[PDB]
Design a protein around this nucleic acid. Structure first.
Ligand code: ZN
Ligand code: ZN
Ligand code: ZN
Length: 85
DNA sequence: AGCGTGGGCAC
DNA sequence: TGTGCCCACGC
């Protein structure tokens, strides 16, 4: 990991500089992506997309066992295991 | 549960 | 780099 975060209080190191560039947003407080519905700002475009589903009710991920739908794949993943014994 | 949000990284 | 997934933790 050649790329160290230059912020004094931070000890994170990255394999790729582009990842350090994304990381630095934490320290600069930069949130370039805004939700046009509630005007909230987010650090990443991926997180803005899933956030928008909280407004639209879009839930693309259905449980294979019971059909319950979720906005995110990881939510469905956390859910499916409840069907275990 | 609902969902913010960082880290890894494919493309 | 931008875009956007998986994974994982947190409240
Ligand atoms: Zn840092
Ligand atoms: Zn919003
Ligand atoms: Zn289910």
């Amino acid at each position: 990991r050649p790329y160290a975060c230059p912020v004094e209080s931070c000890d994170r190191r990255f394999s790729r500089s582009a990842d350090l560039t994304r990381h630095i947003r934490i320290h600069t407080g930069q949130k370039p992506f805004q939700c046009r519905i509630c005007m909230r700002n987010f650090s990443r475009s991926d997180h803005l997309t899933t956030h928008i589903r909280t407004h639209t009710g879009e839930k693309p991920f259905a449980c294979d066992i019971c059909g319950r739908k979720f906005a995110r794949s990881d939510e469905r993943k956390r859910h499916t295991k409840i069907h275990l014994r």
